[PDB]
Amino acid sequence: MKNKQHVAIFPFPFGSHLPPLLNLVLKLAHIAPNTSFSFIGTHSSNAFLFTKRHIPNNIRVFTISDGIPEGHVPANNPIEKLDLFLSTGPDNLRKGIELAVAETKQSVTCIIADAFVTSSLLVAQTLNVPWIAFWPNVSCSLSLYFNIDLIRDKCSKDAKNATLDFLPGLSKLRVEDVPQDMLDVGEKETLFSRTLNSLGVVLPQAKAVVVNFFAELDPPLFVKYMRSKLQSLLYVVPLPCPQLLLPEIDSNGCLSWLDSKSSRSVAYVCFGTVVSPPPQEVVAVAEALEESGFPFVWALKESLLSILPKGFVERTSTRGKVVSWVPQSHVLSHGSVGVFVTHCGANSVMESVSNGVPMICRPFFGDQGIAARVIQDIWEVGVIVEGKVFTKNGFVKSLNLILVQEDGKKIRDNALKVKQIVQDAVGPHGQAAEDFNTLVEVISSS
Numbered sequence: 001m002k003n004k005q006h007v008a009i010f011p012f013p014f015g016s017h018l019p020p021l022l023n024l025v026l027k028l029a030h031i032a033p034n035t036s037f038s039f040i041g042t043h044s045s046n047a048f049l050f051t052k053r054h055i056p057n058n059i060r061v062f063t064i065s066d067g068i069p070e071g072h073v074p075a076n077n078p079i080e081k082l083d084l085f086l087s088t089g090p091d092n093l094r095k096g097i098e099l100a101v102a103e104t105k106q107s108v109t110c111i112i113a114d115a116f117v118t119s120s121l122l123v124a125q126t127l128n129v130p131w132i133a134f135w136p137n138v139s140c141s142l143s144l145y146f147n148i149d150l151i152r153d154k155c156s157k158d159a160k161n162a163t164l165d166f167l168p169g170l171s172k173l174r175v176e177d178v179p180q181d182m183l184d185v186g187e188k189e190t191l192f193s194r195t196l197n198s199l200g201v202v203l204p205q206a207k208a209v210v211v212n213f214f215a216e217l218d219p220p221l222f223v224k225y226m227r228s229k230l231q232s233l234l235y236v237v238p239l240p241c242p243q244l245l246l247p248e249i250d251s252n253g254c255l256s257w258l259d260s261k262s263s264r265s266v267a268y269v270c271f272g273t274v275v276s277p278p279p280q281e282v283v284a285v286a287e288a289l290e291e292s293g294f295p296f297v298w299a300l301k302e303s304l305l306s307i308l309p310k311g312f313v314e315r316t317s318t319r320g321k322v323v324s325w326v327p328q329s330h331v332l333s334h335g336s337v338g339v340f341v342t343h344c345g346a347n348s349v350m351e352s353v354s355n356g357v358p359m360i361c362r363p364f365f366g367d368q369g370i371a372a373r374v375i376q377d378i379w380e381v382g383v384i385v386e387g388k389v390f391t392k393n394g395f396v397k398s399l400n401l402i403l404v405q406e407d408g409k410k411i412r413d414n415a416l417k418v419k420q421i422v423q424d425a426v427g428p429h430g431q432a433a434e435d436f437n438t439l440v441e442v443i444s445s446s
C-alpha cells in the first residue's frame with residue numbers, strides 16, 4: 001500500500017513559538033520518513049525558521065497570508081501583528097492546506113497546531129481529521145484557561161497576594177501572577193486575548209495536547225487535573241534535536257570569556273525580545289550590575305546602548321560583557337554561569353532549569369508571571385527580583401543572595417536537584433519517551 005499519511009502543521013507564526021514546533025516536527029519526520037509533514041507559516045515566519053536551514057525531504061514548507069495588507073504599517077506594540085494574523089481565520093489556513101495537498105497529492109490525515117491557532121481546529125473538523133494542540137508556553141498556565149470566571153472573580157475581589165487554591169497543584173499561584181490578558185474586559189480585549197480565553201473550550205476537542213516540557217517537573221496534581229480535562233496529555237522533551245541547531249560563530253567570544261571565570265560566579269542577564277523594558281529598569285540593571293562587582297554577560301539589544309549610564313560599559317569592561325547576542329544554550333550550559341536574570345520566557349526557563357542555573361526573575365508579559373511564581377515558590381530554584389521591578393538596591397540584593405550568600409544555598413542546591421530530574425526525564429525511560437511514541441502512533445493511525 002502507498003503510505004498516504006500527511007500531517008499539516010500550523011505554528012503560531014511569531015518568534016518564540018517557531019523553533020519549538022519545528023523541533024517537534026523534525027523529530028516526528030525523522031522517525032516517520034514515509035510520512036509527509038507540511039509546515040504552513042507566513043512569509044515572515046518561514047524566513048525566520050528556514051533561511052539558513054536544511055530540512056529533511058519529508059518536510060515541505062508552505063506560505064499563507066500574515067493578515068497585513070500591503071501598505072499597512074502596524075504600530076509598535078506586540079499584539080497588533082498577532083491580531084492581524086488571527087483575523088485571517090480558517091480560510092487562510094485552508095489556503096495552506098490546499099498548497100500542501102496539491103504538492104503532496106495527499107489529503108491531510110492529521111493536523112498539529114500551536115494551541116493559539118484555534119481556527120485550525122475548525123479546519124481539522126471540516127476535514128474530519130484529528131487535531132493535536134501543541135503548547136510551548138509555561139506548562140502550568142494551561143490550568144488558567146479552565147478557570148477564567150473564578151480567576152476574574154478572585155482578581156477583582158481578593159487581595160493581590162491571595163492564592164489560587166482552586167487550581168489543583170497550583171495553590172502557590174497568586175492573583176498578582178495572572179496574565180493581564182485574561183482579565184481584560186471590553187475595549188481592552190483583543191482578538192488575541194479572546195482567542196486565549198477560548199482555550200478552555202477549544203483544548204478538550206483536541207485528540208491530544210502536546211506539552212513542550214518535562215512532566216516530572218510539573219506538580220503531579222496539576223498533571224492529573226489536566227488529564228481530567230483533555231482527551232490525551234502528552235509531554236515531549238523540549239530539548240533541541242541536532243537538526244534544529246544551526247552552528248554559529250561566537251562573535252563576542254562569550255564561551256572563551258566564561259572559561260576565564262570561576263564556576264557559578266557569572267551573572268547572565270537577558271530580558272527578552274518581545275516587550276521593551278522600561279528605560280528606567282534598564283538603567284537600574286546597569287547600576288546594580290556595576291555596583292555588585294560580579295562578573296556578568298548581558299545580552300542587550302543594540303538600540304538600548306544609548307540609555308545605559310554614561311561610562312557604564314567602559315568602567316565594567318574588565319569584568320563584564322554587554323553584547324547584542326549570545327549563544328544562550330551554550331552560555332546557560334557553561335559552568336561559570338551562577339545565575340540567570342530573566343524575564344521568564346518559556347524556552348529561557350527550560351534552558352535554565354535543564355542546566356542547573358538558578359534564576360532572578362522579572363516577569364513582564366503574558367504567562368511570565370506564572371513561570372516566575374513556579375520558579376520561586378514551587379521549584380524553589382530562584383527568586384522574583386526584590387521589588388518586583390528592577391531597582392539598583394533590590395537587584396544587588398538578589399544577585400548577592402543567589403551568587404554568594406549562604407542564605408541562597410537552598411536555591412543553589414535545588415537548581416542542581418532539578419537538573420538531575422531533567423536528566424532522568426529525557427532518559428530512555430522518562431515519561432516523554434513513551435509519550436513521544438504515543439504521538440507517533442496517533443499520526444500513523446490517522
Ligand SMILES: O=c1c(O)c(-c2ccc(O)cc2)oc2cc(O)cc(O)c12
Pocket residue numbers: 014015016017078079082137138141179180181182196274365366367
Ligand atoms: O505564551 C504566551 C506567548 O507566547 C505570547 C506572545 C506574545 C507576543 C508574541 O510575539 C509571541 C508570543 O503572549 C501571551 C499572552 C498571554 O496572556 C499568555 C501567554 O501564555 C502568552
